Amino acid sequence: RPPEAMPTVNATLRIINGNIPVPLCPISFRDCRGTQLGLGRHTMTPAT
Amino acid sequence: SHRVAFVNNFHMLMYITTYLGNGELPEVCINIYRDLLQHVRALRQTITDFTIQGEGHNGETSEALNNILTDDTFIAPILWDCDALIYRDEAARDRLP
Amino acid sequence: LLDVEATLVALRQQHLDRQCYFGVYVAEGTEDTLDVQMGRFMETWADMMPHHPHWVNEHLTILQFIAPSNPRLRFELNPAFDFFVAPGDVDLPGPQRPPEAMPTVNATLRIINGNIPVPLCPISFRDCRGTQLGLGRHTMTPATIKAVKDTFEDRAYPTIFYMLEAVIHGNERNFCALLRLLTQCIRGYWEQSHRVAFVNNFHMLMYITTYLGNGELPEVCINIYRDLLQHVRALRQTITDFTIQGEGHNGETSEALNNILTDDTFIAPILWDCDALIYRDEAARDRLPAIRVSGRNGYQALHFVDMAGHNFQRRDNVLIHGRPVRGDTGQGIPITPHHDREWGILSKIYYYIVIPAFSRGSCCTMGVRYDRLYPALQAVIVPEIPADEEAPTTPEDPRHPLHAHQLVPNSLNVYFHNAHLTVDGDALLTLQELMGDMAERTTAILVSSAPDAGAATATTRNMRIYDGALYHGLIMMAYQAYDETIATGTFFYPVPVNPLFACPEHLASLRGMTNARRVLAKMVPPIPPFLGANHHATIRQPVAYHVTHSKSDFNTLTYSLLGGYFKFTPISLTHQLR
Amino acid sequence: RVVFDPSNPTTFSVEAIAAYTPVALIRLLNASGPLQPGHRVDIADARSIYTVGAAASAARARANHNANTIRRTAMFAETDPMTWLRPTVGLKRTFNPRII
Amino acid sequence: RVVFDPSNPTTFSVEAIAAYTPVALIRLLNASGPLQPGHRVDIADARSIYTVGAAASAARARANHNANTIRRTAMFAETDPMTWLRPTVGLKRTFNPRII
Known about the structure:
This is part of a larger assembly, with 3 copies of chain A and 2 copies of chain D. Helix content of chain A is about 25%, strand content about 0%. By secondary structure, chain A is mainly alpha-helical. Helix content of chain D is about 20%, strand content about 0%.
């Protein structure tokens, strides 16, 4: 049961990259940065 | 139903391609598992490729500072064994655990 | 191109800080390979390494290698030599304890066109060379690819085959006294999971096609073997065009000078027999040759040792071979290699081209502990079959070799149970004819000879070329490190000798894989210097970078490792530039 | 039967019933007592004894299936106290136990 | 049984016994000798007994099969002083010569 403490601003380190809110790092850029990775890499064949 | 088994777990996914792989399971069914562990191992392989080798500091090495997944001070949302908690105490000694 | 006096003697004037004394210092071995791998190269290589790792960084690009801050940019001056800082006032390997002095720069000649570090002949050029070299040459179907690469990257390959090729050891006397069970297990791993068997020794792969491609297989499981053979032969044919005929000089004709895969003076990594030995002995008659068979200068060898001659734990300089198939057998032949040159030139094209493509680095050699391998071989439980009644084929038959009642733990008949194969009486009791050819001890060897006639001046032979190997051991597949019905490191043990097979994930089978060293095995390639070193050798980690990160389309890496196996030595230009 | 007996079963009477039989017997009766005779030991007591009791009642229900099968052996390394001179390989259990 | 002793098998006590017989008895016995009786002599010398006598331990349960098959011929040419006027060709072992 949270006490009746007055409001206050706090801060916490966004530990990883993906914590940046998406209206600052857009899905269309996320998936292109992902696609740059899987270049000549392994991918599951649709049968699987 | 052409529908594979033991996909909602990793231990269940792990306990098959080693032991149930000697030819007991149907090829076109077991090769799915044979592919998925390959996929998780190839997802681990790319972590090494996007980091520099040998720059560890204070317990946590290079690969323990780049990708939050590989680093041992992180935890999985399921705890079957107790080895992950032991491994977050072998390290994390100097991170006030 | 050998004019190096301006960089050798003018170099004992500048200053030299310290690096590791591992990848630049060489030693010798006298004991068996067991402890010198489990106890040596663990505690000293966790004291010599933890200060200033060196020479392994290859992630670099031609933009960062050339900036003024590169620690290596000072020691790279002539593309025909490998400059580095090493322990000085040493001219031989010596003991397993490095001496004390100020460092000193010894030299050595970069041999193959590939040893050029990665951010100078980038992988793009290195695998674009293939499409000019192999333009329309022998490509194989993709289904064989899907099969073989599966077999290689399999996390489930049974150890029955592992023990199988450590109990044949190449000689043909037993090779043909077991064939029923052998085709039966090849069918058992093919017709069950659609993956071929015995792909870990081109010895076996050249053995098989000539005695299983004529009826005792299916038409496809042997055609895959034929693919893997004829592609090797096509790569052997690819260099016939990259040579000029008419410069036979000093025993070695032009066919030997072009590629290192032809060079008889540098020995294959896994040879059981004495082929390239004698092919090389009439060579090197001006190339300062010397050998090291388990710490000893000379070597002895017998013709066939028996079971009553057990003595697995010998120490002397013996190098066993199977049997001379015919002729005389008593005090007659000191030594004869089996066949003509088509063996020692060809048995390593597979090793150095084909396996590195399918492996991509998913392989690691493993010396074999035999004092529990033949002990746990001669106790097969096979059902006697009634003189009148026929033999069974099903595992439900209470008198089939596989029935679920006759199961006695700690037996060889159970390896098939953990394998899901079929066996009978005519297949498993034909095993104990091995009392005529038995491999006692896996060993270690050091061989050296000067360069060929192309790099022979008064100041280059003092930069000799060392080569270490492991006789009568095994090159191994992907490891599990997650099995329990069988142990971790109780039968083999990793002795990483080639940078194609220096996996750290496979190093986890030695007793004592401490995590404080498991961090360094992930970066620095585990290589005992008495069996090979980084700069002083022919195959390198800057070359091994072309097999790991090259991300080829799986049909170009093979041909890419071919033109990258040509020499850059003043004579070696005389043909390649035409 | 034993619904009006406080903590008396306690894996001292449940073992008698078979495996096939008590599955029809638990769903036979309907009510607890009006004087809460089968309540003053909590349901986490009655069920705590009933689970192991049914485990036993099915444990001696398989006390006869032994001489029609083959025994359980060692499926792990579980190193032999006589490991020397002989490497001990575990047996994978996937076969058909039916011996005739 | 015979474990508390200095090299009693001695590549001798095994050709009397059938091949299948002893290998079951390993997981029967539990502990070794208390005085290290057969272990002061090299563990290697002890290992130099069973693996060199087992090819004769199996040779008798294979010497009962001897009268219900066909003896092999060599797998190579194996030049003979009488081979003239008939050329030698070798036989890869495939057949099922147990007499049925």
